């Protein structure tokens, strides 16, 4: 059990990562391209709304 | 010599993921439009439950939504026109998990009885009834969430996740190593990875075929209660018992954003994200919801509408909806 | 569509005259905990465990599928109307580990409106683990009874009575009236057993009436 | 990642002293009630003592009253338990424990095994 | 002049203090359905019983009393005069229906929840409203409380006066039913509830106490003192002066009967304040206001 968790730990290291600049632009274009098609962050008219 | 050179180990990710670190994403959405204070009234309150409902899920049609009470009471309601469709008694009273099925045949439910049972309700003969039990854990059910119709995922409280199959009844793979409950799981678009929570304050990354560990992410301090996932597949936001929610990504392997705020000593127990994946979710324990933006920790908007806790939350696939159960055996849906 | 939505509303109303006729039996069944053992001092007199004293159907439900940590699953009983904690008197010191699980679930953030039964349990064995338990407890050396009375030795009463004030003193410091403790003393007599937790979540109910009416 | 590293302890003769040291980083310490926690050879885990998180309420096992006392410095992070008057019944691994949620009057603490929050533990034998 | 200004503030002062205090429960009872349970089914009727006596008789006795004329006819006192024996017995009966369900919560508590649903609560206050209907619009709609002879048949429906000269068969009955039984009822109930919670503080003081726990008796005495008190403080007086004037005349005034008739329209301005101290009613006020 001592060493199972040590051969676990190799393969949680030998990954490749990308830049957080990078990780998050890619999170921030995504709720820019999709912020049309939101509901909630857009509160749409109550003719096109099922429960007004 | 082997927990001598874990230490070099667990410090040789921790100095790769600062060579990653540049910057903070506060410092990168600092010019974005802000969202402001958002306004959701109740519009439906489904009363039928006896006791504390402690899961709900609702179904891919956006229309019926399944829940869960602690008197033995599976009710799969119609959200349009507040309508019990079914009324499902269960064999033990104490269930904490329920699951819709995205064919919309199927149902499953489990809890102290360390048992998942699935009830299939479009049948041509007659009424709903339980088609197969998956009992081989040994611990509590906490999760369960559906692949396809022969496949589920459930987390249970004995340290292990488990894919399950639906013909046979045996367990297909098998995922071990959290050392503590785990509370909850969450599940990807593509459907070929998982998350999933526990109460040693670490999320883990798993694979369904391969039934092997990715990651591991560990940023909290205490008991992971909830968790969900972007909708792009590439993060994942987590709800802890010390009033934060923290944004980790999967590709940069560390945390993104924290969630707090001074005033709140409460613990999160439901975590879900909007379609656009902007506005976080994110149900309490001193009764009321609160609406964080994504990007900026803002705070945008507060729901209150509940007594006695907030159990379970869900969105639905169209985004035109929010569901809150609560301790005080009402559903609400707010929009 | 038109008798598509008739036939909503007539599924609806089958519903609701089922609902209605369970509720009634969900209100007249008492649930009960038993956070003890099934080690039959107790357990095999009275999961799913159902008697029925006065026509009044009891729920009690002793859990034991569950391995250690119990920090997750004791919340799932906060709708519950007592809990029976029943421990034996009588190593590694298991009666300060039975005080701290005693002292967690009364202060706990869920449980701190339920009021707990507490059996004394293994009373037989007690009276020859008394004559050979005062090194645990340095103040059991300094202790005398005051006024109770109505017990055989004089020794063993003292010892029997020491732990029964060892629960007290945390039962009696946050309670705040919404929630008491009732200790007894049990030893394989548990035919009147069965009663004791009858005339116990009696007095539960009772007591949690009149404080909502402010007369106690 | 949440660390409780231990410290002191040690091979002494009965009668002495010791002092064990709990440095803690992961989390903020002012909120969480601490406990030590030994565990005898042969025997399972054994409650010791805790205290409050100001300072306030200290509480201890009745076998350990008088001699044992445990204090905290929440400005360095650093959990102590000094101890006096020892006895060959007292060789055990302590432990250096926490409660699971911050702002919390009770503790669901050690278990038979895997408690998340715990420590290595430093060998104390007389 | 002092008697008419005086009058005409101290008593529209009443009329504030009942058409407030009986609204500020029932935008609370009605509004948010966290206190919507069984038990406050009971104290809403009895909120639309006090305002409804706090809207309708009131002011028109005000107005009665000072303009020493009544001004409305005949096709109105009579209305009137069953809108008040109305509002009054439906009063005091609900104090009742209040008091029995006090009553069967804590003597039988194993067959209260399973007994009493929440709707078999709206029979009881349906018998409550037909059985108050019963002595109000009945005998007098239908003139069958008698209005005696000729002192009192030329101030019948003449004009300019219309009082309540009863017989000896309507001015006992319709007493009783009010007042007596209702009496007979809650002394009976509460001197049941009082040997309930003297019970339980003696077991709770024997097992529990010399942990510095008869002190917590002036609780449940202090209590029962002042809903039993006020109700009877109140009313007790009127049902009094109104047996002994039919049984011998000239011994009370036209002005001592008014003025102990007034007594007991001042007991439903203290009910928002006595059967309204719940936890879950207090920060319902103030979440109300403010
Ligand atoms: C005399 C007047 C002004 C009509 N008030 C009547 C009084 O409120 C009342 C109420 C209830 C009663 O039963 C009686 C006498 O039966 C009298």
New interface residues.
């Given amino acids: 059990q001592a060493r199972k968790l040590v051969e676990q730990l190799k393969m949680e290291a030998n990954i490749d990562r990308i830049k957080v600049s990078k990780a998050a632009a890619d999170l921030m274009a995504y709720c820019e391209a999709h912020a049309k098609e939101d509901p909630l962050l857009t509160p749409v008219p109550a003719s096109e709304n099922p429960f007004r | 010599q082997l927990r001598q050179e874990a230490e070099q180990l667990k410090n040789q990710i921790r100095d790769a993921r600062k060579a990653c670190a540049d910057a903070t994403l506060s410092q990168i959405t600092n010019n974005i439009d802000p969202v402001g204070r958002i306004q959701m009234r109740t519009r439906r309150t489904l009363r039928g439950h006896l006791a504390k409902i402690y899961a709900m899920h609702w179904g891919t049609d956006s229309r019926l939504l399944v829940s869960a009470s602690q008197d033995g009471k599976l009710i799969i309601w119609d959200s349009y026109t507040t309508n019990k469709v079914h009324a499902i008694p269960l064999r033990s009273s104490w269930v904490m998990t329920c699951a819709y099925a995205p064919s919309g045949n199927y149902v499953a439910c489990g809890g102290l009885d360390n048992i998942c049972s699935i009830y299939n309700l479009k049948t041509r003969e007659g009424n709903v009834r339980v088609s197969r039990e998956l009992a081989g854990h040994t611990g509590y059910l906490s999760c369960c969430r559906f692949l396809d119709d022969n496949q589920i995922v459930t987390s249970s409280g004995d340290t292990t996740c488990a894919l399950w199959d639906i013909e046979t009844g045996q367990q297909t793979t098998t995922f071990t190593g959290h050392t503590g409950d785990v509370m909850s799981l969450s599940l990807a678009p593509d459907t070929r990875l998982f998350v999933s929570g526990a109460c040693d304050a670490s999320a883990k990354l798993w694979d369904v075929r391969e039934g092997m560990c990715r990651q591991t992410f560990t940023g909290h301090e205490s008991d992971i209660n909830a968790i969900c996932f972007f909708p792009n597949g590439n993060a994942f936001a987590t709800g802890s018992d010390d009033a934060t929610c923290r944004l980790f990504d999967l590709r940069a392997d560390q945390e993104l954003m924290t969630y707090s705020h001074d005033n709140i000593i409460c613990g999160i127990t439901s975590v879900s994200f909007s379609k656009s994946g902007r506005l976080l979710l994110a149900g309490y324990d001193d009764f009321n919801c609160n609406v964080w933006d994504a990007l900026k920790a803002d705070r945008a908007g507060v729901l209150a509408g509940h007594?006695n806790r907030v159990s379970c939350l869900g969105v639905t696939d169209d985004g035109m909806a929010v569901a809150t159960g609560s301790w005080?055996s009402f559903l609400k849906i707010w929009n | 569509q038109r008798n598509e939505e008739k036939a909503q509303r007539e599924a609806n109303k089958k519903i609701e005259k089922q609902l209605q006729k369970d509720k009634?039996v969900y209100?007249?069944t008492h649930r009960l905990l038993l956070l003890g053992a099934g080690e039959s001092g107790k357990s095999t007199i009275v999961f799913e465990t159902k008697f029925q004293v006065?026509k009044?159907n009891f729920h009690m439900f002793d859990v034991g599928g569950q391995r250690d940590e119990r920090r997750k699953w004791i919340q799932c009983f906060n709708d519950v109307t007592a809990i029976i904690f029943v421990v034996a008197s009588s190593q590694t010191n298991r009666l300060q580990e039975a005080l701290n699980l005693f002292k967690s679930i009364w202060n706990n953030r869920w449980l701190r409106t339920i009021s707990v039964i507490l059996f004394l349990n293994k009373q037989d064995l007690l009276a020859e683990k008394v004559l050979a338990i005062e090194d645990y407890f340095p103040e059991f050396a300094r202790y005398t009874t005051?006024e109770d009375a109505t017990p055989e030795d004089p020794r063993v009463t003292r010892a029997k009575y020491f732990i029964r004030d060892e629960f007290?003193?945390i039962?009696?410091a946050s309670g705040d009236g919404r929630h008491?403790?009732?200790?007894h003393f049990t030893c394989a007599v548990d035919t009147e057993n069965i009663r004791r937790v009858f005339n116990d979540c009696?007095?539960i109910?009772?007591?949690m009436?009149?404080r909502?009416?402010?007369?106690? | 990642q949440v660390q409780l590293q231990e410290s002191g302890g040690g091979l002494v003769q009965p009668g002495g002293s010791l002092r064990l040291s709990c440095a803690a980083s992961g989390f903020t310490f002012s909120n969480y009630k601490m406990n030590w926690v030994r565990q005898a050879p042969g025997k399972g885990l054994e409650w010791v003592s805790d205290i409050s998180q100001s300072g306030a309420s200290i509480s201890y096992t009745g076998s350990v009253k008088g001699r044992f006392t445990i204090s905290r410095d929440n400005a360095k992070n650093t959990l102590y338990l000094q101890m006096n008057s020892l006895k060959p019944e007292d060789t055990a691994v302590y432990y250096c424990a926490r409660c699971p949620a911050p702002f919390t009057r009770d503790c669901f603490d050690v278990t038979s095994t895997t408690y998340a929050y715990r420590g290595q533990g430093t060998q104390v034998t007389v | 002049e002092v008697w008419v200004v005086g009058m005409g503030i101290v008593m529209s002062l009443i009329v504030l203090a009942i058409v407030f205090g009986n609204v500020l429960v029932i935008t609370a009872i009605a509004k948010f359905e966290?206190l919507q349970t069984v038990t406050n089914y009971f104290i809403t009727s009895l909120a639309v019983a006090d305002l409804v006596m706090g809207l309708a008789v009131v002011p028109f006795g005000a107005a009665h009393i000072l303009t020493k004329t009544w001004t409305f006819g005949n096709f109105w006192c009579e209305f009137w005069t069953s809108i008040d024996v109305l509002c009054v017995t439906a009063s005091i009966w609900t104090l009742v229906v209040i008091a029995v369900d006090?009553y069967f919560?804590?003597t039988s508590?194993?067959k209260y929840?399973?007994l009493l649903?929440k709707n078999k609560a709206r029979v009881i206050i349906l018998m409550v409203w037909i059985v108050s209907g019963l002595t109000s619009f009945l005998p007098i709609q239908m003139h069958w409380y008698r209005a005696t002879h000729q002192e009192a048949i030329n101030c019948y429906a003449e004009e300019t006066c219309c009082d309540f000269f009863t017989n000896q068969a309507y001015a006992i009955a319709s007493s009783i039913v009010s007042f007596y039984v209702p009496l007979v009822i809650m002394v009976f109930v509460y001197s049941r509830?009082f040997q309930?919670?003297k019970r339980?503080?003696q077991?709770?003081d024997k097992?529990?106490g010399?942990?510095?726990?008869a002190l917590?008796e002036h609780?449940?005495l202090k209590?029962?003192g002042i809903i039993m008190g006020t109700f009877t403080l109140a009313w007790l007086p009127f049902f009094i002066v109104n047996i002994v004037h039919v049984i011998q005349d000239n011994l009370i005034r036209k002005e001592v009967y008014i003025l102990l008739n007034w007594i007991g329209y001042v007991n439903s301005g203290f009910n928002p304040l006595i059967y309204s101290?719940?936890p879950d009613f207090r920060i319902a006020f103030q979440e109300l206001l403010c």
């Fill in positions: 007594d005080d | 009634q209100r007249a006065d009044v005051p007290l003193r039962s009696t008491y403790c009732y200790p009696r007095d109910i009772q007591r009436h009149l909502q009416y402010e007369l106690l | 966290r006090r919560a804590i508590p194993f929840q399973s649903t509830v309930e919670a339980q503080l077991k709770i097992s529990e010399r942990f510095h726990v917590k609780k449940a209590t029962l101290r719940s």
